[PDB]
From a paper:
Using the local reconstruction method, we further improved the three-fold region of the head to a resolution of 3.4 Å. In comparison with the previous study of the T5 head, we built a more accurate atomic model of the pb8 monomer from residues 164–457 (out of 458 residues) based on our high-resolution density map. MCP pb8 adopts a canonical HK97-like fold and can be divided into four domains: an extended N-arm (residues 164–191), a P-domain (residues 192–205, 245–306, and 407–451), an E-loop domain (residues 206–244), and a complex A-domain (residues 307–406, and 452–457). During the maturation of the capsid, the first 160 residues of the N-terminus of pb8 undergo proteolytic cleavage, and this process also occurs in the MCPs of E217 and HK97. The asymmetric unit of the icosahedral head comprises 13 MCP gp8 monomers (a fifth penton, a hexon I, and a hexon II) and 2 pb10 monomers. We resolved only the α-helical domain, from residues 2 to 68 (out of 164 residues), which contains five α-helices: α1 (residues 4–10), α2 (residues 17–24), α3 (residues 25–30), α4 (residues 33–41), and α5 (residues 49–62). A structural comparison of our α-helical domain with the nuclear magnetic resonance (NMR) structure of pb10 in solution reveals that the α1 and α2 of the pb10 monomer undergo substantial conformational changes from the solution state to the assembled state. In contrast, our high-resolution structure indicated that the binding sites of pb10 were consistent in all hexons, likely due to minor conformational changes in the centers of the two types of hexons.
Bacteriophage T5, a representative member of the T5-like family of siphophages, serves as an excellent model for studying the assembly, infection, cell wall perforation, and DNA ejection mechanisms of this phage family. In this study, we used cryo-electron microscopy (cryo-EM) to determine the structures of mature T5 (a laboratory-adapted, fiberless T5 mutant) and urea-treated empty T5 (lacking the tip complex) at near-atomic resolutions. The T5 head comprises 775 copies of MCP gp8, arranged into 11 pentons and 120 hexons, forming an icosahedral shell with a triangle number (T) of 13. The T5 tail, which comprises 40 trimeric rings of the TTP and a distal tip complex, is connected to a unique five-fold vertex of the head by the connector complex.
Residue numbers in the entry:
A (entry chain L): 205 to 255
B (entry chain K): 205 to 457
C (entry chain L): 307 to 408
D (entry chain I), E (entry chain H): 358 to 408
F (entry chain J): 164 to 204
G (entry chain b): 2 to 67
Write the structure that this text describes.
Amino acid sequence: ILTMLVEPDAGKATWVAASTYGTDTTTGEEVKGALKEIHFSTYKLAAKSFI
Amino acid sequence: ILTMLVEPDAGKATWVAASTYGTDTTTGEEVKGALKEIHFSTYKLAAKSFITDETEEDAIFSLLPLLRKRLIEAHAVSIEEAFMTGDGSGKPKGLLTLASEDSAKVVTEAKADGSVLVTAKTISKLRRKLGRHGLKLSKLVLIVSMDAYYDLLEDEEWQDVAQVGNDSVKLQGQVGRIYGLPVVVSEYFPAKANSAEFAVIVYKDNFVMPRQRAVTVERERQAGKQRDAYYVTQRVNLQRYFANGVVSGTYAA
Amino acid sequence: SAKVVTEAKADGSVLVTAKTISKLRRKLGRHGLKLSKLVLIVSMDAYYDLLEDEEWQDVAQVGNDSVKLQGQVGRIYGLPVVVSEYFPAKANSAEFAVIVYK
Amino acid sequence: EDEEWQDVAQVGNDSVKLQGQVGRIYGLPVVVSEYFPAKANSAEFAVIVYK
Amino acid sequence: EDEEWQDVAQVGNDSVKLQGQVGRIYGLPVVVSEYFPAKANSAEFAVIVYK
Amino acid sequence: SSSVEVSSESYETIFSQRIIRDLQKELVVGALFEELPMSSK
Amino acid sequence: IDYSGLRTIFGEKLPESHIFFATVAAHKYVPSYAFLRRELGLSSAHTNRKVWKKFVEAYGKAIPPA
């Protein structure tokens, strides 16, 4: 198998913040995400002969 | 704030008649103008990520680049979206939202549910609203929604080589120029619906991005909670020198 | 869910006209628009119907690349055309084309 | 306003939209005079003499 | 007045509107004579001999 | 301005003196023609 | 445009392009590719067989229902 992560979708950034500068809220809400693993695998194909 | 002054609008001069000539009125009516002002300002943008020290140990891979990528992408995503469609209340008013205010969302024949398609003409016809802010043609940009771009390729109008040139769709496939405007596709228009928006024809020179701070990263190890917080903050807006300048199209209602 | 069903019919009637082939790009989605990152594999009997397409047929409708003048539709609507025969047999449903994001 | 002579595929670099004066019609030079009888029913609009 | 020969995108620089004398039809030279039998039913308007 | 050490207004603006005006309708019918330098009424 | 009137001149099937335009009778109902093309909303940019083929289809599509 091959499990490769996929970076999740776009978070978006807290646009406002506004008057509150210096308070905790100026840094905005968390932009967060979860990586999504996706598996890969290989099937086997063969042929045979007899000389 | 940055305030620039806008020159006052033109004032006509009286056509003085013969009666006057030596009457103090022979010189007409005073042309008085007041230098108006334009004010610019900024709106913040922000993000927090926390990586607990325990996790980096817990998991196999690092996870650190992702936090950074996410935050910077988020500022871009938000800015790109905001600039397109912003409430204006706290976020930058946007090309789509500015047009609506200026009564420039031109409802067009293009139809939601297929049926009419967004043909090139429907997109070029938007230029009329721009007004004089329109004729030059090398100072304009066209941003069409992805669905429009796709509809623009299937426009029967641009495919025929004796209909457009060696640039016809049949022959080429990528409608690159519509009626003298470059075509650039973005997908951050509102999604297809009755009304909604498929295209804007901003008059670029009118818009400036007032800055004040640019994307910076500050890591604040918060021991006692064992996290290291990356707080990336940024402050910018999109404002227009003058009220006119963008005209947007809408699918028909 | 990308088996767009085109109107082209089996047993003559319509032929798979060229336009039908590039209509399909829309269902690709965002991935579709770029156009230099796609490949078109058409069934052999949809290359013989891309020729009889009324559209690619005229030095005017197209360019110096028109069929009467040349004979091999090499480009359809901005996509390269590559012919393979392994597609299933023409019949109802069936497939005449696919356009992968390589 | 002859729909016939107006395009550049209905004629050449001599088309009206592009140029504005139909100078040649079907191989004849075109010369305009205002001395033709006044426009009316019947009347005459062209004479193709033999010089 | 064959609608067929009268365009520059239909024929070439040899189109009627532009020129006025159909001199070549489909690869044959055109020579006009007026001793063909009088126009009438049946009658003849053209001959194409193997000289 | 939300911090200790504030400064009065007008101190947070740069007041550019760039005077910008708009597109301003173009004038075409005045200059095209020629003049008859009249020297009498 | 006047497919109906043309039916009197040419019944079901339309003759080939050369003859249709040639016929004096049809000239009035449709004169030259200028008229046919403008009526179809086609352009000089569309090649004439495309304009004719479209005209022929209209002639059939429109044919009296029977």
